[PDB]
Every structure is written in structure tokens, then in C-alpha cells.
Amino acid sequence: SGHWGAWMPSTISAFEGTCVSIPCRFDFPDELRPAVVHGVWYFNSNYPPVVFKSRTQVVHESFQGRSRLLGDLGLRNCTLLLSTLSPELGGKYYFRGDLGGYNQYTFSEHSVLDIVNTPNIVVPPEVVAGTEVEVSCMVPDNCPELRPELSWLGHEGLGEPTVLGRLREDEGTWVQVSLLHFVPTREANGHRLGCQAAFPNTTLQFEGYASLDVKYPPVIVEMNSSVEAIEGSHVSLLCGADSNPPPLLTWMRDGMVLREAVAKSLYLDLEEVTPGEDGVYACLAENAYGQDNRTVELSVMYAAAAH
Ligand SMILES: *[C@@H]1O[C@H](CO)[C@@H](O[C@@H]2O[C@H](CO)[C@@H](O[C@@H]3O[C@H](CO[C@H]4O[C@H](CO)[C@@H](O)[C@H](O)[C@@H]4O)[C@@H](O)[C@H](O)[C@@H]3O)[C@H](O)[C@H]2NC(C)=O)[C@H](O)[C@H]1NC(C)=O
Ligand SMILES: *[C@@H]1O[C@H](CO)[C@@H](O)[C@H](O)[C@H]1NC(C)=O
Ligand SMILES: *[C@@H]1O[C@H](CO)[C@@H](O)[C@H](O)[C@H]1NC(C)=O
Ligand SMILES: *[C@@H]1O[C@H](CO)[C@@H](O)[C@H](O)[C@H]1NC(C)=O
Ligand SMILES: *[C@H]1O[C@H](CO)[C@@H](O)[C@H](O)[C@@H]1O
């Protein structure tokens, strides 16, 4: 139609020290035919500073030499270019139309600018060993003058990355996405995943890091061999298990629980050990992703000396 209104991405992101182009289109009643279209861009911070003002060419000091209007206002194109970004410039940007006389219109729709300094690494909330896992590095690509070069850090045993390239997201903005597809093992637990966004012809370089929390079933690593004890002596049986999260350890005999605790290792203490304590003892390691069990035989085969 021919009505008052604007169109711009509600949210948009860009790296610190780079630039950002905020795509903008506005509309007005055709009946006016002003032949001269003026406009004003405001920043979020009762008395908002002026980013751009076509009539008086006035610019707030925080935007001087950093703000430039791309596209013709006469073509209903209010696209804004912001250069040499700094955290201070993070906030809401809204546009105001000026068609002379009483025809000034501050449009409702605005754009939130998020200035970042680290790439976005996306890891699924639950990484389990033995399952194919996708990990992505996302980076804003809304700067026409400076294109980010995406790269991974510390991804040796995770396979070679697959670059998706420039992808469109909602509200008509752009991102750079790189992928990692791999089946992690228990060894991949605690793996440092790093992503780097570098800009050629500049000294700008941004790095982000994340640690892989890889879940895996218990594997009993510490277990006593065949125990041959002296009569009346003290016997300590130790059972250690490696799992993520830490397992529930349980010492059992004759289908009866002797000791039980949520830990990496668990001791079973036997005092004044008699031949009646002979038999097979079992340690059970169990968590949310599996279980493991080991048995040990206890033999009181050494007679106690007189003392
Ligand atoms: C409102 O005004 C905006 C600004 O005036 C308009 O945005 C511009 O739209 C034009 C299309 O007419 C774009 O020009 C194109 O640019 C691409 C650049 O891609 C290549 O170049 C980069 C670096 O140079 C390179 O890294 C890439 O790999 C590509 O090879 C060219 O490929 C095209 O041939 C064409 O020249 C402007 O780039 C674009 N500017 C911005 C800031 O977005 C907008 O379209 C206007 N809106 C409407 C509705 O007309
Ligand atoms: C980046 O390249 C432009 C021209 O492509 C050049 O004018 C500018 O000096 C370069 N930046 C740096 C930091 O050298
Ligand atoms: C079982 O192994 C643990 C750790 O190696 C040790 O401390 C403990 O004494 C062993 N048990 C016996 C009965 O030797
Ligand atoms: C102990 O682990 C073995 C794996 O070989 C499994 O077959 C068995 O059912 C387990 N026993 C118990 C009581 O969970
Ligand atoms: C703009 O001005 C008002 C809206 O505030 C209406 O008369 C009409 O929508 C026009 O486009």
C-alpha cells in the first residue's frame, strides 16, 4: 500500500572494531509527493543522540566519522552504515521520516545492535560417547567492507571441518557457519574447542573457546586381583571406575549390599577377617549411560601366628 511504516531487522550483530550495515526500508502515503525526503536515525540512550540527520547534517560525537547513510531516502531506502564499532554503540536504533511541513514520522520498528568480541560456538546440551555429534561455529557477516575468515582451533581428533559459508538468518541478516561432525569417545571428554574469526588486511582477530562435556558409561579401571588374606588381618578392597558423570559404586556379596556411594572409587573394609568371609565379592559401577561390574575372590588361606 501507501502507508507509514518501516522495515528493519529487530536484532543484528557485528564484531567490535568492524562495521555493520543495517538494512532499512520505509513507506509513506504516495499522495504527498514531497520531491525531497529527509530522515533521522536515533540511538537508544529521554534524549536520544543523533546518528544521522539529513537536514542539518548534525551528528553526535560518538557517531562522527562512523555513521553514513547508504541508499537513497527518495527511493524509500534508509539503510544505515556504522563503521569502527565499539561497545558504546550497542543498543537500539530507530528511524524517523521527514517529508517537510508537519509530515514527520517516527516509525515503531527498531533495530537492536549487539556488538561482540567472540565467535559463537554451538554445542548440543547433551554430548554422549558413541553418538554422532554436530558442533557449529557461528559468526556475524553483516559488514560488507570486512569479511570474516572462519577457522577452528584444537580440533585434531574431531575430523576435518565442513564450511557452510554465508547463510541467511531471520530478519534478513547474515552469518558465517562452520561445522564439525564426529563420533566422540571417552577420550574426547574435556576437549578444548576453539574458533577463530580473522579479518584480512586488519589486525582484528577474535577467539572463542568451549570444553566438550562428553558423557560415557562406567569402566572399572581399579580392581583387586585374587586376594589371599591372613587370618584376623584387615582387608581393604578397592574399586575404581571412570565415567561421566561419576558413577554409583556398590560392593555386594550374596546379593546383599555391603557399601554404596556416588564416587570415582570406593573402599570395602573387612576387619578380623575369618574363613566365613570367604567368597566372591562384586563391585557394580553404574550411571545414566551404562554400567560395568567386576568380581574378586577373597581367600583366608593363611593361619594367624600366635602373638
Ligand atoms: C538499499 O540500499 C543499500 C545500500 O545502498 C542496498 O544494499 C546494496 O545492494 C547492492 C545491490 O544493488 C549491493 O551491491 C552488490 O554487492 C555485491 C558484493 O558481493 C561481492 O563483493 C564482496 C566484497 O566486495 C565479496 O566479498 C563477495 O564474495 C561478493 O563477491 C556484488 O556481488 C554485486 O554485484 C553488487 O555489486 C551492495 O553490496 C549492497 N550494500 C549493502 C551495504 O548492503 C540495498 O539493496 C538497497 N535496498 C533496495 C531494496 O534496493
Ligand atoms: C585495508 O584495505 C584498504 C583498501 O583495500 C586500505 O585502504 C586499508 O589501509 C587497509 N587496512 C589496513 C589496516 O592496512
Ligand atoms: C586393592 O588395591 C588397592 C589399590 O591398589 C590397595 O590399596 C589394597 O590394599 C588392595 N587390596 C588388597 C587386599 O591387597
Ligand atoms: C555385568 O556386566 C556384563 C557385561 O559383560 C553383563 O553381561 C552383566 O549382565 C552385568 N551384570 C550385572 C549384574 O549387571
Ligand atoms: C501515516 O500516518 C497515519 C499513521 O500514524 C495514518 O494516517 C496513515 O497510516 C499514514 O500512512
Numbering used by the authors: 19 to 63, 68 to 329
What did the original publication write about this model?
MAG is a type 1 single-pass transmembrane protein expressed on myelinating oligodendrocytes in the CNS and Schwann cells in the PNS23. Myelin-associated glycoprotein (MAG) adhesion and signalling at the myelin–axon interface regulates the formation and maintenance of myelinated axons, thus playing an important role in the development and function of the nervous system. MAG adhesion maintains the myelin–axon spacing (periaxonal diameter) by interacting with specific neuronal gangliosides (glycolipids), such as the major brain gangliosides GT1b and GD1a. On the basis of the primary sequence its extracellular region is predicted to consist of five Ig domains; an N-terminal V-type Ig domain that is typical for Siglecs and four C2-type Ig domains.
To obtain more detailed information on MAG–ligand interactions, the commercially available trisaccharide 3′-N-Acetylneuraminyl-N-acetyllactosamine (Neu5Ac-α2,3-Gal-β1,4-GlcNAc) was soaked into the MAG1–3 crystals, as these provided higher resolution data. For the soaked crystals, diffraction data was collected to 2.3 Å resolution. The crystals were isomorphous to the unsoaked MAG1–3 crystals and a Fo(soaked)−Fo(unsoaked) map revealed clear electron density in the oligosaccharide binding site for one of the two MAG1–3 chains in the asymmetric unit. Most likely the other chain remained unliganded due to occlusion of the binding site by crystal packing. The ganglioside binding side is formed by the CC′ loop and the F and G β-strands of the N-terminal V-type Ig1 domain. In agreement with previous data, the side chain of R118 in strand F forms a key salt bridge with the carboxylic acid group of the sialic acid in the trisaccharide ligand. Y65 in the CC′ loop forms extensive Van der Waals' contacts with the ligand as well as a hydrogen bond to the O9 of the Neu5Ac sialic acid. Other contributing interactions are made by: (1) the backbone carbonyls of N126 and T128 in strand G that form hydrogen bonds with H-N5 and the H-O9 of the sialic acid respectively, (2) the backbone amide proton of T128 that forms a hydrogen bond with the O8 of the sialic acid and (3) the side chain of Y127 that forms Van der Waals' contacts with the glycerol group (C7–C9) of the sialic acid. Ligand interaction of MAG is similar to the sialic acid recognition of other Siglec family members.
